[PDB]
Amino acid sequence: MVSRFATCCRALGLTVNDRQRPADLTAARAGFAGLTHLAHDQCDAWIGLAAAGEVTPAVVDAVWRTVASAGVLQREIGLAAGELGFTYDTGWYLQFRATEPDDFQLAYAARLYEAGEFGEADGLVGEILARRPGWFDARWLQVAINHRAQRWSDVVRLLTPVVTLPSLDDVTSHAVRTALGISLARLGMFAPAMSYLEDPAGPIEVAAVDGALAKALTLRAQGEDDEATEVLQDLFATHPENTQVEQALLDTSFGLVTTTSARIEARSDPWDPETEPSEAE
Protein backbone atom coordinates (compact mmCIF):
# COMPACT_ATOMS: atom_id res chain seq x y z
CA MET A 1 0.00 0.00 0.00
CA VAL A 2 2.67 2.56 0.99
CA SER A 3 4.78 1.83 -2.17
CA ARG A 4 1.70 2.15 -4.34
CA PHE A 5 0.78 5.44 -2.63
CA ALA A 6 4.31 6.82 -3.13
CA THR A 7 4.21 5.90 -6.81
CA CYS A 8 0.78 7.49 -7.34
CA CYS A 9 2.04 10.66 -5.58
CA ARG A 10 5.03 10.82 -7.92
CA ALA A 11 2.58 10.70 -10.89
CA LEU A 12 1.13 13.96 -9.48
CA GLY A 13 4.60 15.51 -9.91
CA LEU A 14 5.36 15.54 -6.17
CA THR A 15 8.85 14.82 -4.88
CA VAL A 16 8.85 11.64 -2.81
CA ASN A 17 11.95 10.17 -1.16
CA ASP A 18 14.01 12.70 -3.20
CA ARG A 19 12.69 11.39 -6.53
CA GLN A 20 10.52 13.45 -8.89
CA ARG A 21 9.11 13.04 -12.40
CA PRO A 22 6.89 15.18 -14.69
CA ALA A 23 3.24 14.89 -13.69
CA ASP A 24 0.92 12.55 -15.65
CA LEU A 25 -2.52 13.36 -14.25
CA THR A 26 -4.34 10.77 -16.39
CA ALA A 27 -2.09 8.09 -14.90
CA ALA A 28 -2.36 9.62 -11.41
CA ARG A 29 -6.18 9.49 -11.65
CA ALA A 30 -6.20 5.85 -12.74
CA GLY A 31 -3.54 4.98 -10.15
CA PHE A 32 -5.31 6.55 -7.19
CA ALA A 33 -8.65 5.14 -8.37
CA GLY A 34 -7.19 1.64 -8.26
CA LEU A 35 -5.63 2.36 -4.90
CA THR A 36 -9.11 3.24 -3.48
CA HIS A 37 -10.14 -0.41 -4.18
CA LEU A 38 -7.22 -1.70 -2.05
CA ALA A 39 -7.40 1.02 0.61
CA HIS A 40 -11.09 2.01 0.53
CA ASP A 41 -10.88 3.44 4.07
CA GLN A 42 -7.63 5.42 3.56
CA CYS A 43 -8.43 9.15 3.25
CA ASP A 44 -5.12 9.80 1.48
CA ALA A 45 -6.03 7.54 -1.46
CA TRP A 46 -9.21 9.59 -1.99
CA ILE A 47 -7.38 12.89 -1.48
CA GLY A 48 -4.91 11.73 -4.13
CA LEU A 49 -7.68 10.90 -6.57
CA ALA A 50 -9.12 14.38 -6.04
CA ALA A 51 -5.63 15.91 -6.31
CA ALA A 52 -5.29 14.20 -9.73
CA GLY A 53 -8.44 16.01 -10.84
CA GLU A 54 -11.35 13.64 -10.03
CA VAL A 55 -13.24 15.99 -7.64
CA THR A 56 -16.64 14.38 -7.89
CA PRO A 57 -19.38 14.20 -5.23
CA ALA A 58 -18.46 10.53 -4.69
CA VAL A 59 -14.80 11.45 -4.07
CA VAL A 60 -15.68 14.39 -1.75
CA ASP A 61 -18.07 12.03 0.11
CA ALA A 62 -15.28 9.47 0.51
CA VAL A 63 -12.68 11.98 1.67
CA TRP A 64 -15.11 13.04 4.38
CA ARG A 65 -16.16 9.47 5.26
CA THR A 66 -12.51 8.48 5.79
CA VAL A 67 -11.28 11.80 7.31
CA ALA A 68 -9.97 10.03 10.48
CA SER A 69 -7.03 8.79 8.39
CA ALA A 70 -6.16 12.08 6.68
CA GLY A 71 -2.41 12.36 6.31
CA VAL A 72 -1.63 8.80 7.49
CA LEU A 73 -0.14 7.68 4.17
CA GLN A 74 1.35 11.16 3.57
CA ARG A 75 3.34 10.79 6.76
CA GLU A 76 4.41 7.21 5.85
CA ILE A 77 6.00 8.56 2.62
CA GLY A 78 7.41 11.75 4.15
CA LEU A 79 5.32 14.35 2.31
CA ALA A 80 5.44 17.82 3.78
CA ALA A 81 2.10 19.26 4.93
CA GLY A 82 0.13 20.98 2.18
CA GLU A 83 1.76 19.19 -0.74
CA LEU A 84 -1.17 16.84 -1.33
CA GLY A 85 -4.41 18.66 -1.87
CA PHE A 86 -7.31 19.23 -4.21
CA THR A 87 -9.34 22.11 -5.61
CA TYR A 88 -13.03 22.22 -4.85
CA ASP A 89 -15.84 24.46 -6.04
CA THR A 90 -17.60 26.54 -3.40
CA GLY A 91 -20.63 26.76 -5.68
CA TRP A 92 -20.32 30.54 -6.06
CA TYR A 93 -17.41 32.03 -8.01
CA LEU A 94 -14.54 30.76 -5.88
CA GLN A 95 -12.58 27.60 -5.81
CA PHE A 96 -10.53 26.69 -2.73
CA ARG A 97 -7.61 24.36 -2.08
CA ALA A 98 -8.25 21.54 0.41
CA THR A 99 -5.41 19.90 2.35
CA GLU A 100 -6.74 19.55 5.96
CA PRO A 101 -9.90 18.14 7.66
CA ASP A 102 -11.55 21.59 7.96
CA ASP A 103 -11.12 22.09 4.21
CA PHE A 104 -12.68 18.65 3.62
CA GLN A 105 -15.55 19.68 5.87
CA LEU A 106 -16.19 22.77 3.73
CA ALA A 107 -15.95 20.74 0.51
CA TYR A 108 -18.48 18.32 1.94
CA ALA A 109 -20.74 21.23 3.06
CA ALA A 110 -20.55 22.49 -0.56
CA ARG A 111 -21.55 19.05 -1.82
CA LEU A 112 -24.40 18.87 0.70
CA TYR A 113 -26.01 22.24 -0.11
CA GLU A 114 -25.74 21.58 -3.83
CA ALA A 115 -27.70 18.37 -3.10
CA GLY A 116 -30.32 20.32 -1.13
CA GLU A 117 -29.05 19.46 2.36
CA PHE A 118 -28.88 23.05 3.45
CA GLY A 119 -29.36 22.49 7.18
CA GLU A 120 -26.57 19.90 7.46
CA ALA A 121 -24.32 22.14 5.34
CA ASP A 122 -25.02 25.20 7.43
CA GLY A 123 -24.39 23.23 10.63
CA LEU A 124 -20.98 22.02 9.45
CA VAL A 125 -19.90 25.50 8.40
CA GLY A 126 -21.21 26.96 11.67
CA GLU A 127 -19.23 24.41 13.64
CA ILE A 128 -16.12 25.71 11.91
CA LEU A 129 -16.98 29.34 12.33
CA ALA A 130 -17.38 28.81 16.13
CA ARG A 131 -13.63 27.84 16.17
CA ARG A 132 -12.36 29.89 13.23
CA PRO A 133 -14.68 32.92 12.89
CA GLY A 134 -12.16 34.88 10.82
CA TRP A 135 -11.46 32.13 8.29
CA PHE A 136 -12.52 33.52 4.87
CA ASP A 137 -13.12 30.07 3.28
CA ALA A 138 -15.74 29.19 5.86
CA ARG A 139 -17.32 32.66 5.79
CA TRP A 140 -17.65 32.33 2.01
CA LEU A 141 -19.10 28.80 2.26
CA GLN A 142 -21.81 30.18 4.55
CA VAL A 143 -22.54 32.94 2.03
CA ALA A 144 -22.69 30.35 -0.82
CA ILE A 145 -25.17 28.17 1.15
CA ASN A 146 -27.40 31.24 1.70
CA HIS A 147 -27.04 32.20 -1.97
CA ARG A 148 -28.33 28.86 -3.22
CA ALA A 149 -31.27 29.11 -0.81
CA GLN A 150 -31.98 32.61 -2.21
CA ARG A 151 -31.43 34.18 1.23
CA TRP A 152 -30.34 37.48 -0.20
CA SER A 153 -30.56 39.44 2.99
CA ASP A 154 -28.20 37.02 4.76
CA VAL A 155 -25.72 37.36 1.92
CA VAL A 156 -25.76 41.15 2.24
CA ARG A 157 -25.54 40.97 6.08
CA LEU A 158 -22.64 38.51 5.94
CA LEU A 159 -20.73 40.39 3.26
CA THR A 160 -21.18 43.86 4.73
CA PRO A 161 -18.13 43.46 7.06
CA VAL A 162 -16.18 41.33 4.49
CA VAL A 163 -16.18 43.83 1.59
CA THR A 164 -14.21 46.38 3.67
CA LEU A 165 -11.49 43.93 4.83
CA PRO A 166 -7.84 44.87 4.07
CA SER A 167 -5.59 42.70 1.96
CA LEU A 168 -8.34 40.82 0.04
CA ASP A 169 -6.83 39.75 -3.24
CA ASP A 170 -8.26 40.73 -6.64
CA VAL A 171 -10.08 37.40 -7.15
CA THR A 172 -11.64 37.40 -3.66
CA SER A 173 -12.63 41.06 -4.02
CA HIS A 174 -14.30 40.41 -7.35
CA ALA A 175 -16.37 37.56 -5.92
CA VAL A 176 -17.38 39.54 -2.82
CA ARG A 177 -18.34 42.72 -4.71
CA THR A 178 -20.27 40.74 -7.35
CA ALA A 179 -22.15 38.69 -4.74
CA LEU A 180 -23.01 41.85 -2.69
CA GLY A 181 -24.14 43.73 -5.83
CA ILE A 182 -26.38 40.90 -7.05
CA SER A 183 -27.83 40.35 -3.58
CA LEU A 184 -28.65 44.05 -3.17
CA ALA A 185 -30.37 44.08 -6.51
CA ARG A 186 -32.34 40.95 -5.51
CA LEU A 187 -33.60 42.98 -2.50
CA GLY A 188 -34.68 45.83 -4.78
CA MET A 189 -31.77 47.93 -3.50
CA PHE A 190 -30.84 49.08 -6.98
CA ALA A 191 -28.78 52.22 -6.31
CA PRO A 192 -26.69 50.32 -3.68
CA ALA A 193 -26.30 47.46 -6.16
CA MET A 194 -25.05 49.86 -8.81
CA SER A 195 -22.23 51.03 -6.52
CA TYR A 196 -20.82 47.48 -6.93
CA LEU A 197 -22.14 46.55 -10.38
CA GLU A 198 -21.46 49.76 -12.38
CA ASP A 199 -18.07 48.22 -13.36
CA PRO A 200 -18.63 44.45 -13.10
CA ALA A 201 -15.30 43.52 -14.80
CA GLY A 202 -12.73 41.50 -12.91
CA PRO A 203 -10.56 38.35 -12.91
CA ILE A 204 -13.46 35.87 -12.39
CA GLU A 205 -15.09 35.40 -15.76
CA VAL A 206 -18.38 33.97 -14.38
CA ALA A 207 -18.64 36.88 -11.87
CA ALA A 208 -18.06 39.45 -14.67
CA VAL A 209 -20.93 37.86 -16.68
CA ASP A 210 -23.32 37.68 -13.67
CA GLY A 211 -22.35 41.21 -12.60
CA ALA A 212 -23.05 42.66 -16.05
CA LEU A 213 -26.37 40.79 -16.33
CA ALA A 214 -27.45 42.08 -12.92
CA LYS A 215 -26.24 45.55 -13.86
CA ALA A 216 -28.48 45.44 -16.94
CA LEU A 217 -31.51 44.19 -15.03
CA THR A 218 -30.91 46.86 -12.38
CA LEU A 219 -30.83 49.60 -15.07
CA ARG A 220 -34.04 48.17 -16.53
CA ALA A 221 -35.71 48.38 -13.08
CA GLN A 222 -34.59 52.04 -12.89
CA GLY A 223 -36.17 52.72 -16.29
CA GLU A 224 -32.84 52.98 -18.14
CA ASP A 225 -34.04 50.66 -20.91
CA ASP A 226 -31.63 51.67 -23.67
CA GLU A 227 -28.61 51.53 -21.32
CA ALA A 228 -29.72 48.06 -20.18
CA THR A 229 -29.93 46.94 -23.84
CA GLU A 230 -26.40 48.25 -24.54
CA VAL A 231 -25.03 46.37 -21.56
CA LEU A 232 -26.81 43.18 -22.59
CA GLN A 233 -25.72 43.51 -26.26
CA ASP A 234 -22.08 43.99 -25.25
CA LEU A 235 -22.42 41.00 -22.94
CA PHE A 236 -24.16 38.78 -25.55
CA ALA A 237 -21.62 39.70 -28.25
CA THR A 238 -18.84 38.36 -26.00
CA HIS A 239 -20.94 35.41 -24.71
CA PRO A 240 -23.10 34.49 -27.73
CA GLU A 241 -24.08 31.04 -26.36
CA ASN A 242 -25.35 32.38 -23.02
CA THR A 243 -29.09 31.72 -23.09
CA GLN A 244 -29.72 33.62 -19.86
CA VAL A 245 -28.18 36.76 -21.35
CA GLU A 246 -30.08 36.09 -24.61
CA GLN A 247 -33.42 35.84 -22.68
CA ALA A 248 -32.88 39.22 -21.02
CA LEU A 249 -31.69 40.88 -24.24
CA LEU A 250 -34.65 39.61 -26.36
CA ASP A 251 -37.42 40.19 -23.83
CA THR A 252 -37.22 43.86 -22.82
CA SER A 253 -39.96 43.31 -20.21
CA PHE A 254 -37.95 40.55 -18.38
CA GLY A 255 -36.96 41.86 -15.00
CA LEU A 256 -35.03 40.80 -11.95
CA VAL A 257 -37.39 39.09 -9.47
CA THR A 258 -36.90 40.79 -6.06
CA THR A 259 -37.85 40.21 -2.47
CA THR A 260 -37.32 41.65 0.99
CA SER A 261 -35.69 40.63 4.28
CA ALA A 262 -39.12 40.40 5.93
CA ARG A 263 -40.46 38.02 3.28
CA ILE A 264 -37.36 35.84 3.57
CA GLU A 265 -37.70 35.82 7.37
CA ALA A 266 -41.31 34.74 7.07
CA ARG A 267 -40.52 31.48 5.30
CA SER A 268 -41.90 28.48 7.15
CA ASP A 269 -38.79 26.53 5.99
CA PRO A 270 -35.78 28.91 6.07
CA TRP A 271 -34.02 26.91 3.32
CA ASP A 272 -36.94 26.64 0.86
CA PRO A 273 -37.76 29.66 -1.34
CA GLU A 274 -41.11 27.95 -2.11
CA THR A 275 -42.22 28.76 1.45
CA GLU A 276 -41.45 32.48 1.06
CA PRO A 277 -44.61 34.64 0.88
CA SER A 278 -44.88 36.84 -2.23
CA GLU A 279 -45.28 40.65 -2.03
CA ALA A 280 -49.06 40.06 -2.43
CA GLU A 281 -49.23 37.47 0.43
UniProtKB/Swiss-Prot annotation:
UniProt keyword tRNA-binding present: no
Compartments where found: Cytoplasm
Keyword terms, alphabetized: ATP-binding, Cytoplasm, Nucleotide-binding
Region of interest: Disordered: 265-281
MF GO annotations: ATP binding; ATP hydrolysis activity
Entry GO terms, CC: cytoplasm
Composition bias type Acidic residues, residue spans: 271-281
Self-association and partners: Part of the ESX-3 / type VII secretion system (T7SS), which is composed of cytosolic and membrane components.
Role description: Part of the ESX-3 specialized secretion system, which is required for siderophore-mediated iron acquisition and for the secretion of EsxH and EsxG. EccA3 exhibits ATPase activity and may provide energy for the export of ESX-3 substrates.
Similarity comment: Belongs to the CbxX/CfxQ family.
Record's protein name: ESX-3 secretion system protein EccA3
Protein's organism: Mycolicibacterium smegmatis (strain ATCC 700084 / mc(2)155)
Positions spanned in the full protein: 21 to 300 of 608
